[PDB]
Amino acid sequence: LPQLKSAVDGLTEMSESEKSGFISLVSRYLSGEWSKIQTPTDEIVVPYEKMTPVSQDVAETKNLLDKLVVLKLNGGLGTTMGCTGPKSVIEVRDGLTFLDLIVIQIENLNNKYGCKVPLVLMNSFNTHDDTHKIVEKYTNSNVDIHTFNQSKYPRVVADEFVPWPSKGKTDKEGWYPPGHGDVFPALMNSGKLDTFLSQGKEYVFVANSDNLGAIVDLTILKHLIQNKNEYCMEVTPKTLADGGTLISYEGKVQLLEIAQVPDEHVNEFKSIEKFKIFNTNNLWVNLKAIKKLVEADALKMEIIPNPKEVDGVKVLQLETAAGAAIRFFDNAIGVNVPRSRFLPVKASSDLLLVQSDLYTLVDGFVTRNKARTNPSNPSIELGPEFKKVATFLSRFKSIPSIVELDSLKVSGDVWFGSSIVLKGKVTVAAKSGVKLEIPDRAVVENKNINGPEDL
Ligand SMILES: O=c1ccn([C@@H]2O[C@H](COP(=O)(O)OP(=O)(O)OP(=O)(O)O)[C@@H](O)[C@H]2O)c(=O)[nH]1
């Protein structure tokens, strides 16, 4: 460890608090009970439906809102989805980006109630420049937008265990942002937590930039303030399709990830029958509690190694998760929310869902079509032909109707025309060297289309 510290102190590009923060993760990493796991009670993981909504007194709502900061995690790139820049600036619905919609929602809150709720974006050294030029578009918007850069840590060469920039990899690829658990130290380090405290704010609502369900929820905010919950994680029921779970362990609610489960217990962990809930990454956190625990160096989340191979070299990228911080705060709870609060956009297939007749946009919010029977969204699986946002859009002249869809799987070189209707279970599979065009106004129900012979 003394050699690692010297090496890090040799990296003059690192801030003093980044160096100490990194050595602290490294130290913990280099150092360090299934039968004890319990299901949380309903008082620790509160069903959303038991929470008291705000009264009709608009003044009560304004006073809750005056205490709030909305934060979006914005440290990630549009790379999975074939886009350069930050994921948040992908157009998600009606030509509006994730960031456009977040801004609209907050404007509408401020207009409706007379509050001045700010928006803050946590960027990384990979997204900060693009984001900073983009946010100028909201200069005259009815919301103050703050940005800050999270920590920038050296990738560590796995074998020798030395900082990669110490071996001369000082360009962008030598470094990494150490996960969303870094939100707590970065908020302090950047100065932004102090600015909001000085503005009389008390809580931050943190969410993934690409979660379209993560809207300010007055019922939760009310609960935190009335009941003095310093941390509240939104969890949602676990489905076959899902996730870190909340457990009760040694008297505390804690995040449990598969990484910390013994091999013999991994299959039971994946039972949506044993663990019924999972973390949405919608997190409500008391700002004074954050300052106190960060300054006391008390946030000791599980280390996630996240190994990668970059430019030939195998590296470690020690990180932490924001949800794992729950066990350090006072009177922490989960709240078990309807899945309406969890609509992630991770791939083109999710764009198909949200750009379809399954949703519309109301007042900046992606709003589910009430005509659909199933409360669950249909499963959409698309081949790599559809991976890039541009290519996805090119393969759909319009987004087909899917209100009556159970599932779609598409593979091979497939192109969709306009005004298509899909129902029940649908597969479209173009063989090697075949291009399949689904014609305009096709109605496809409970069908496998395996070639032109099938339509
Ligand atoms: O270091 C980090 C990590 C990630 N994040 C942010 O945490 C949230 C969840 O981070 P994920 O990595 O789980 O979401 P993603 O959608 O970027 O995942 P991929 O499909 O690309 O694998 C996202 O909003 C991301 O931008 C950060 O802000 N900083």
UniProtKB/Swiss-Prot annotation:
UniProt: UTP binding residues: 73-76, 87, 150, 179, 210, 346
Disruption phenotype: Reduced number of seeds. The double mutants upg1 and ugp2 display severe growth defects and male sterility due to the absence of callose deposition around microspores.
Protein name: UTP--glucose-1-phosphate uridylyltransferase 2
Record's catalysed reaction(s): alpha-D-glucose 1-phosphate + UTP + H(+) = UDP-alpha-D-glucose + diphosphate
Gene name, Swiss-Prot/TrEMBL: UGP2
The keyword Nucleotidyltransferase appears for this protein: yes
Family: Belongs to the UDPGP type 1 family.
Binding site for substrate: 75-76, 180, 208-210
Cell compartment(s), UniProt: Cytoplasm
InterPro entries listed in its UniProt record: Nucleotide-diphossugar_trans, UDPGP_fam, UDPGP_trans
Its EC number(s): 2.7.7.9
